[PDB]
């Protein structure tokens, strides 16, 4: 099988397609190109041939096998944000990625995942008592900012635990994400004309310098520390690995950065969307509340409770299916292969359009939000919200814990209303690297009225 997609008009196809990605945003471009051409098609980002693929089979092949455990993107852009051959998220050096990932994987499972269930709860509680910090005169809560701050507090107290300016760092993290998003697929040309990216360069510096402060203190505390065996955590594990000779200070520093931003970037937007679904789906809200009564009562949330919360689990999955935040995934082929029908050379970029795939394949009612879609056990090869295999989401397990943890603690205490008719469908979203609300609009606030 030869490959679908636009014509290579002797060097115009590549320029229009890259330009389309820049103009529309990565995610909407992927959808455009899938809807026009096949569910398996070719495009160019910069020069290199880049496949955009929504076919469940192809997705599964790619994530399963070890010769796709790379991503891609502008080397100059990645260098700019400090992700070029450094952390793990966009660390495309196979050997260096291989050696770094285990640190993340240890921290996001076993005992740390058990700790997380209560660290999440206490953080949100603590923030819901300080609801003045986020609420209007008119009673409107800035849910996004609330969520970001608890995601950051949570992440800190589990992986690092140094005191910090919660509010300031949340704003800096947003700046870093925006920068990352901007520069990820910008052509080299862009980086020559340098009053066009100095803007972003400063966002990165601001976050990177704020974290250098924290990791500096963390270093001091480790050197003085007496019973070092007792109080292990992600930051420490890394720092100790450097102190052997396994890791580089620069790399450590990026991994710490990357762990802190991860949840503020993604969890908060997912829970936001989930809250807007709860608002406009009262049928489901009851079921969830009934389940909480049955299972938890007015006891504190505990690790053993989370498996029992079957309805909420399905709610989360359906929210992530229907309204994804991470609707697409970037890989690269490290060896040649045949993939479904088509041949794929090494160095070929890949974009798995998992958000489109969740509407085209397995589910009874793909285009409407219903828990009937998760009434019958879903095979993991028809629904990958986190990905799987050697480079799947490192937080995939702990994330589900955290989402159940915060929804329970919030919905226990507050009914959630949404201003006007506003719903997830009527929210105006940007659809570039991730899929998230356009924050330059308004009517993104919510209202929290008590229970009992
Ligand atoms: C709703 C929540 C989340 C979703 C939907 C999500 C989804 C994803 C997806 C699709 C990937 C790409 C995996 C692949 O290429 O197959 C990914 C990567 C990643 N996620 Fe998440 N994620 C979430 C939360 C988190 C959290 C809370 C953390 C950390 C605390 C995290 C850390 C990562 C990391 C480190 C990677 C990169 C793995 C690598 O490239 O080696 N994620 N995530
Ligand atoms: C989940 C994630 C990591 C943690 C974080 O801080 C923010 C994001 C959002 C973008 C995700 C990324 C992981 C890698 C993804 C899936 C891609 O290959 C394209 C989009 C990108």
Swiss-Prot record:
Pfam families per record: p450
Annotated residues for binding of substrate: 265, 330
Record has Mitochondrion as a keyword: no
Cofactor: heme
GO terms, biological process: androgen catabolic process; estrogen biosynthetic process; female genitalia development; female gonad development; mammary gland development; negative regulation of chronic inflammatory response; negative regulation of macrophage chemotaxis; positive regulation of estradiol secretion
Residues spanning the membrane: 259-279
EC numbers on record: 1.14.14.14
Pathway(s) per entry: Steroid hormone biosynthesis
An example Gene Ontology CC term for this record: endoplasmic reticulum membrane
Keywords, in A-Z order: Disease variant, Endoplasmic reticulum, Heme, Iron, Lipid metabolism, Membrane, Metal-binding, Microsome, Monooxygenase, Oxidoreductase, Pseudohermaphroditism, Transmembrane, Transmembrane helix
Result when mutating residue 220 to H: 2.5 fold decrease in affinity for androstenedione substrate; slightly affects PKA-mediated reduction in catalytic activity as measured by estrone synthesis from androstenedione in vitro (28% decrease compared with 36% for the wild-type protein) and PKG/PRKG1-mediated reduction in catalytic activity in vitro (15% decrease compared with 30% for the wild-type protein)
Location relative to the cell: Endoplasmic reticulum membrane; Microsome membrane
Binding site residues for heme: 393
Expression sites by tissue: Widely expressed, including in adult and fetal brain, placenta, skin fibroblasts, adipose tissue and gonads.
Keyword Lipid metabolism: yes
Catalytic activity, reaction form: testosterone + 3 reduced [NADPH--hemoprotein reductase] + 3 O2 = 17beta-estradiol + formate + 3 oxidized [NADPH--hemoprotein reductase] + 4 H2O + 4 H(+); androst-4-ene-3,17-dione + 3 reduced [NADPH--hemoprotein reductase] + 3 O2 = estrone + formate + 3 oxidized [NADPH--hemoprotein reductase] + 4 H2O + 4 H(+); androst-4-ene-3,17-dione + reduced [NADPH--hemoprotein reductase] + O2 = 19-hydroxyandrost-4-ene-3,17-dione + oxidized [NADPH--hemoprotein reductase] + H2O + H(+); 19-hydroxyandrost-4-ene-3,17-dione + reduced [NADPH--hemoprotein reductase] + O2 = 19-oxo-androst-4-ene-3,17-dione + oxidized [NADPH--hemoprotein reductase] + 2 H2O + H(+)
Sample GO molecular function, one term: estrogen 2-hydroxylase activity
Main location, first listed in the record: endoplasmic reticulum
Changes after translation: Phosphorylated in vitro by PKA and PKG/PRKG1. These phosphorylations inhibit the catalytic activity as measured by estrone synthesis from androstenedione (36% decrease for PKA and 30% for PKG/PRKG1).
Protein's membrane topology: Multi-pass membrane protein
Protein family membership: Belongs to the cytochrome P450 family.
Function text: A cytochrome P450 monooxygenase that catalyzes the conversion of C19 androgens, androst-4-ene-3,17-dione (androstenedione) and testosterone to the C18 estrogens, estrone and estradiol, respectively. Catalyzes three successive oxidations of C19 androgens: two conventional oxidations at C19 yielding 19-hydroxy and 19-oxo/19-aldehyde derivatives, followed by a third oxidative aromatization step that involves C1-beta hydrogen abstraction combined with cleavage of the C10-C19 bond to yield a phenolic A ring and formic acid.
Disease field: Aromatase excess syndrome: An autosomal dominant disorder characterized by increased extraglandular aromatization of steroids that presents with heterosexual precocity in males and isosexual precocity in females. Aromatase deficiency: A rare disease in which fetal androgens are not converted into estrogens due to placental aromatase deficiency. Thus, pregnant women exhibit a hirsutism, which spontaneously resolves after post-partum. At birth, female babies present with pseudohermaphroditism due to virilization of extern genital organs. In adult females, manifestations include delay of puberty, breast hypoplasia and primary amenorrhoea with multicystic ovaries.
Name of the protein in its database record: Aromatase
Lineage per the UniProt record: Eukaryota, Metazoa, Chordata, Craniata, Vertebrata
